[PDB]
Amino acid sequence: ERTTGRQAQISNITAAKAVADVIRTCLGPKAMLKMLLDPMGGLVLTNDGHAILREIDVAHPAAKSMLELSRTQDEEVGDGTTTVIILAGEILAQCAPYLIEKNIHPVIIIQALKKALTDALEVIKQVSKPVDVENDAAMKKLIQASIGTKYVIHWSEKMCELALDAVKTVRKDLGQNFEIDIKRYVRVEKIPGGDVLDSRVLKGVLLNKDVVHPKMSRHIENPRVVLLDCPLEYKKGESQTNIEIEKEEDWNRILQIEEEQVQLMCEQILAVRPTLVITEKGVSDLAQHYLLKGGCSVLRRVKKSDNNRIARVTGATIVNRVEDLKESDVGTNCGLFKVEMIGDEYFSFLDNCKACTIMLRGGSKDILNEIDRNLQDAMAVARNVMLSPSLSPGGGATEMAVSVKLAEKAKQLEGIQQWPYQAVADAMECIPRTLIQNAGGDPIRLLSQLRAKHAQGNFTTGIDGDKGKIVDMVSYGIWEPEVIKQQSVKTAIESACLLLRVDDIVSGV
């Protein structure tokens, strides 16, 4: 029913702490795969944090808040998902003692944490170095960084390629910020089989819809594309259109009219001399015929999302009513119209030998979803940099810097206001630690050394994954988008600040 007092507080903290506990063995280069079972049927074999926590229903309110943190974070940057959860926990946990043990009110611990966040954020931008968003080589060895710790690493280079080759493709600066809608303009397409490398980033689209009529062009050299909303069949009246006939030879009259309007429609289209007509709706058998000899291949039923991406790699602006069909609505700038038959399943291409279609190949419909998600992380950190050319010391280095500059300051602040501040510092340290642990090396040992080396000797010094020894980032490098280090710490400290505002929990609508 009800639970006021530290009772509340505790269960919240423990709850939140437990959330972390699950995916903590998923943060690191040697991170394991949490094969989860969804209710609907299938499975999820991913190790990408947010993709795990999504597939786990929780009860305790805090555990629900803690769980959605991984989502809002997966919405800002594509990466840094697992990290925010672990941090968001350790913060609450590291407050636990001064929260009750040292009887500090939640207002005070909040007043400090909100303060320690800003200072902490400084130390992030302070250690961050900028980068050439255009230097293909830098972007690659940047995207590569956030491809490690995932099944997609055995082709790491191959991945950053398909990543950049797609981030830049749908990009479109615009200024009067840079707009990169990976979502609506980079439709992926996972096709079972082949090899990983056998996957490319076609600059166009790929529909499996075949051709409306047999004897129709399998591939127009340079096709003239015409995209339209409206269907291709005899329309009807949006009023009480009811016909009364007693005039004998009138049946034939009307029944004919239908053929007649389908004709007109074919005309208006055929007019601008098209070779490829792709409509979102249907295609009357009649209309097929008049578009056959009219000289063009037809494609019926294609999703809006599928269509509007075509209209960016054909230029062919989509148009509804045909009696208004302009000639500006061309089909210029569009290579071939291949129709490769991929294992008993016909496809259609529209490459040009603004929106690309990443086509992945692996070894199962299952294994592909691993790739797709892994790729998304790549293609997202690429976008981040595109809109914030700043990077942060990976290997948990940044995380340790903030640990010290804060630890130092806290110790030199004096007042009850110090303890909560001190905790944010002590908290931060958990990431290089989770890393060192999931590496196998001795946490107490490596950290003391990493922390010390940090205290003076440079701040771009994190821990090396497969190794387990402290290395300098600059050295073997593994910087990550500075944006990630923003959110991870922004919302984590917020989460903590929210849950700490709770002193009572109640049940009933």
């Binding site: 423990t14 079972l37 630690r433 642990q437 001795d442 946490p443 107490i444 040992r445 950290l447």
Partner: protein
């Protein structure tokens, strides 16, 4: 759907420590600790424990509360045991055995967090304990003259 493996015994519950068990236990202890943490001292409070046969009981003492309760957590029963040692083998100090035994395990997880081994924390604790008994033998200020003189007794009781 989900399978299940390596089972051939009967229907038990094995809490492997490699599953963050030490802390699950610190929790259970942490709970009964708060009960004793407010019973100690003159400023301590009482608790009314109502018997499993239905009898009222009110006591500041710790070894008694614990006795009258239906403890069940194995890691907790252990500390309730120590509260027995104290009541039998000393009659007094029953409350302080709890508060420390618990507080020890509390500031104990802080270490387990870093990475300190179980066995390392044990050793360090014993090393610190034996060392702690030494000082007490010399931190000793006065000593009753064993006078046993009635008035000398009232200074102790």
């Amino acid at each position: 759907q989900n399978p299940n493996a390596g089972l051939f015994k009967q229907g038990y519950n094995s809490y492997s420590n490699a599953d963050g068990q030490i802390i699950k236990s610190i929790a259970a202890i942490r709970e009964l600790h708060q009960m004793c943490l407010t019973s100690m001292g003159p400023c301590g409070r009482n608790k009314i424990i109502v018997n499993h046969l239905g009898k009222i009981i009110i006591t500041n003492d710790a070894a008694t509360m614990l006795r009258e309760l239906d403890i069940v957590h194995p890691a907790v029963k252990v500390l309730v045991m120590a509260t027995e040692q104290q009541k039998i083998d000393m009659g007094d100090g029953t409350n302080l055995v709890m508060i420390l035994a618990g507080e020890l395990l509390n500031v104990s997880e802080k270490l387990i967090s870093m990475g300190l081994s179980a066995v390392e924390i044990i050793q360090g604790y014993n090393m610190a304990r034996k060392f702690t008994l030494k000082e007490l033998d010399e931190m000793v200020v006065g000593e009753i003259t064993d006078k046993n003189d009635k008035n000398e007794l009232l200074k102790m009781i």
